[PDB]
């Protein structure tokens, strides 16, 4: 009995951490902002944080706004907040500068003041009640995940081959576990209903599930809905449906929301607010259909 | 010199590193393929090696055979293949020849394996005459192109770790000079693909990569169309940020891909799509080769 | 048309080696699964190995796990079936079949190989 | 994970109602297939996903599913239609693929 929407993650109380993921160019940063959006509206008691672990952030071009590493709230709301992080001004900042730069660029370094970003935030609640992850694409969004998981095993034998460290070593302990508690820690798996994004996917949702993240919602935007004479839409819509067939069929046990290709541009607060509402109540193509005209531009 | 098209680079006898990147979606990989095919038709006595820097790999998808560490000629190509480097298995082989797996699953180990396959190729040539770069989404592959400048920096600091601290050295002015190294962009004619293809352009002419190849993929050309609300709205959008494409960029190549009826996979179909890399494409003449895949 | 077709079964000692082959015809072998399932004499159906050449993941039943190994040639459109330190147990008919990646249901076998271990 | 398939064989007559069930250890949500074999034959697919019908099977063969218990049913059993039933599951959770003990359907006299 598993609802076309993500109404019940969008008004849990229990979720603290929600990535938002899947391969290139699906709709992660647009539907991460609209689960952002959704939240906050409908728990305006609670304080949420939209944070980008893609290292080429896009929530500053969505919204409209300059976001930094410091959280500041999304103007138009009251209790979203966004963050994109930035490797060479955050190790600046540490530091008080050449070589901190020069840190700054090695690969990695990126999933690494993520963690130190979800980190702090742990110890801050033993701010914001729900965090939210625009992650990066596929690839390097699952060694972020493995982490946790990394950092543990790691740390012992760091230890050994050698009192802070102790602390930091409970603390890497409580997010591994967090992120396996399916109260707590979600995965929504965004992706359109294209032959090579379902091999991705599937590939995505198999490795997820390996590491005891909790994965029972997907995302498949850019949906045509055709069915009246365009040849490539009918052609395209034809491709469409035949393969959301096959994922209604393998994931019966999810969460499948199906979103519209909107004819106009999904951005700012509001065309961000007006499309979210398709993640709440499922999409009706008949009747909500003139929606994907409404945008403002 | 700037006319609409890769006739120039896919006919080029000197480049000997081609990247392809750009924004998550817009068709890296498609394009990626259809370069190194090009390249290999045009080209029939040189070798030509496609790697696929991208964790997520998208080679063995697009062309439908399995692909790994070891480099595989594609099937019905006699100068085409293609690699998917695979994290895992490659430390776990370093560690049979001479706490693997966890240095496997480390952020990074993937750009460092990448550049370990190019750092090898150097030696080698010290093979294939050209190597053609699928890369990771543009976050992640401005890391990687910097990690010769990073580890030239690092290293010499630090201080055969002189052979090694020369090998880096190599590729850094290999991949600074524009007749070896370019970098070609792929993007659509959308608004967020606006701001981090310059952003991208931009910060790669500052680590001294030419670029001067930007494909504008998935357009709709809808004017152009059979004869729809949807379409016409979006190719009135597409076609307002293209016009402004041609204006910054007036210096670089601007090359424009049709969105297809069809799925582009499989070595027939990239071929197909190929050919308008090549001589460009025109909506009027070429518009019926978007349904025949 | 879709079809399968095994070969390779024959005559080996307990202990040895025999490996099967699975050539598939009117699809891609990359996008799909392949299955073994094998029938000893007067016995049942016994799945004892899939590969998902797309997701490069295989599994196997306990009773040939360590023994047995599932691969493909995607060049060749090809699955193969490597069996090591046979026994009588494993004495039986050799059904390859296929299977969808949204859909692990088998619906195009092979005509079967036969396998026969004794000395 | 166990499949229990009954009965192990039943005696029945052209035009009879045959049911076949199986259960299964744990939940495996729909993920549940049928099959028919004839001696000396490879299996035929029949259902998928517990009550759907494969393509080109006759209509009198149907599945349906309720919580772990599945059952096959013949409507109105046809002379070709005696041989030897099969469950199989295939759960997306496990990649483990496993059958029923079988269910042979022989002629009454």
């Known amino acids: 009995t598993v609802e076309p929407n993500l109404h019940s993650l969008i008004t849990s109380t229990t979720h603290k951490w929600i990535f938002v993921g899947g391969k290139g160019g699906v709709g992660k940063t647009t539907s991460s902002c609209s689960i952002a959006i959704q939240m906050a509206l409908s728990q305006p008691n609670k304080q949420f944080l939209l944070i980008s672990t893609n290292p080429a952030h896009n929530l500053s071009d969505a919204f409209g706004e300059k976001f930094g590493k410091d959280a500041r709230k999304v103007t138009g709301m009251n209790n979203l907040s966004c963050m994109e992080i930035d490797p060479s001004a955050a190790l600046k900042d540490m530091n008080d500068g050449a070589l901190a730069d020069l840190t700054g660029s090695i690969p990695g370094i990126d999933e690494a003041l993520s963690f130190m970003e979800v980190m702090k935030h742990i110890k801050r609640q033993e701010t914001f009640d729900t965090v939210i992850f625009d992650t990066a694409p596929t690839g390097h969004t699952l060694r972020f995940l493995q982490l946790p998981n990394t950092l543990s095993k790691l740390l012992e034998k760091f230890g050994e081959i050698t009192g802070k460290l102790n602390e930091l070593k409970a603390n890497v302990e409580t997010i591994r576990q967090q992120f396996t508690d399916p109260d707590l820690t979600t995965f929504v798996c965004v992706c359109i209903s294209e032959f090579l994004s379902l091999y991705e996917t599937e590939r995505l949702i198999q490795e997820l599930i390996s590491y005891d993240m909790d994965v029972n919602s997907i995302i498949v935007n850019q949906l045509l809905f055709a069915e009246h004479n365009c040849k490539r839409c009918q052609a395209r819509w034809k491709m469409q449906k035949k393969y959301l067939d096959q994922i209604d069929e393998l994931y019966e046990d999810f969460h499948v929301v199906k979103m519209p290709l909107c004819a106009g541009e999904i951005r700012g607060l509001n065309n961000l607010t007006k499309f979210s509402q398709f993640l709440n109540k499922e999409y009706n193509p008949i009747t909500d259909g003139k929606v994907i005209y409404e945008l403002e531009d | 010199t700037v006319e609409p098209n890769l006739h120039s680079l896919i006919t080029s006898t000197t480049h000997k590193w081609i990247f392809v990147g750009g924004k998550g979606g817009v068709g890296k990989t498609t394009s990626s393929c259809s370069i190194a095919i090009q390249m290999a038709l045009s080209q029939p006595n040189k070798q030509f090696l496609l790697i696929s820097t991208n964790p997520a790999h998208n080679l063995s998808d697009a062309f439908g055979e399995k692909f790994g560490k070891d480099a595989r000629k594609v099937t019905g190509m006699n100068n085409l293949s293609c690699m998917e480097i695979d994290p895992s298995a490659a430390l776990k082989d370093m560690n049979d020849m001479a706490l693997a797996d966890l240095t496997g699953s480390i952020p990074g180990i993937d750009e460092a394996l990448s550049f370990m396959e190019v750092m090898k190729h150097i030696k080698r040539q010290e093979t294939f005459d050209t190597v053609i770069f699928d890369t990771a989404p543009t976050g992640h592959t401005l890391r990687f192109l910097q990690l010769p400048n990073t580890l030239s920096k690092l290293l010499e600091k630090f201080g055969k770790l002189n052979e090694l601290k020369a090998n880096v050295e190599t590729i850094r002015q290999q991949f600074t000079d524009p007749d070896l190294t370019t970098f070609v962009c792929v993007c659509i004619s959308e608004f967020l693909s606006l701001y981090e293809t310059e952003r991208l352009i931009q910060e790669l002419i500052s680590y001294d990569m030419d670029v001067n190849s930007i494909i504008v993929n998935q357009l709709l050309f809808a004017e152009n169309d059979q004869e729809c609300k949807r379409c016409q709205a979006r190719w009135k959008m597409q076609k307002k940020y293209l016009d402004q494409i041609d204006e910054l960029y007036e210096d670089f190549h601007v090359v424009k891909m049709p969105l297809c009826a069809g799925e582009i996979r499989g070595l027939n179909n990239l071929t197909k799509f190929s050919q308008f890399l090549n001589k460009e494409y025109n909506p009027i003449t070429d518009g019926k080769v978007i349904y025949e895949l | 048309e879709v079809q399968l077709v095994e070969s390779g079964g024959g005559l080996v000692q307990p202990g040895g080696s025999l490996r099967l082959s699975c050539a598939a015809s009117?699809?891609?072998?990359?996008?799909?699964?392949i299955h073994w399932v094998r029938q000893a004499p007067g016995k049942g159906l016994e799945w004892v190995a899939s590969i998902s050449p797309y997701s490069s993941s295989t599994s196997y039943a306990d009773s040939v796990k360590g023994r047995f190994t599932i691969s493909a040639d995607t060049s060749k459109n090809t699955a193969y079936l490597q069996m090591n330190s046979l026994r009588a147990e494993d004495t039986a008919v050799y059904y390859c079949?296929?299977?969808?990646?949204?859909?692990?249901?088998?619906?195009?076998w092979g005509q079967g190989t036969l396998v026969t271990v004794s000395s | 994970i166990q499949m229990t398939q009954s009965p192990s064989s039943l005696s029945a007559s052209v035009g009879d109602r045959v049911t076949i069930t199986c259960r299964a250890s744990?939940?495996?949500?729909?993920?549940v297939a049928w099959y028919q074999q004839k001696p000396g034959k490879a299996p035929k697919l029949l259902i998928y996903s517990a009550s759907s019908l494969y393509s080109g099977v006759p209509s009198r063969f149907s599945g349906s599913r309720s919580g772990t218990d599945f059952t096959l049913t013949i409507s109105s059993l046809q002379p070709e239609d005696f041989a030897t039933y099969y469950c199989?599951?295939?759960?997306?959770?496990?990649?483990?693929?496993?059958f029923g003990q079988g269910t042979k359907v022989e002629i009454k006299r």
């Open positions: 744990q939940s495996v949500s729909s993920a």
């Open positions: 009117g699809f891609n072998l990359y996008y799909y699964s």
């Open positions: 079949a296929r299977g969808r990646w949204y859909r692990r249901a088998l619906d195009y």
């Open positions: 199989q599951q295939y759960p997306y959770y496990s990649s483990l693929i496993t």
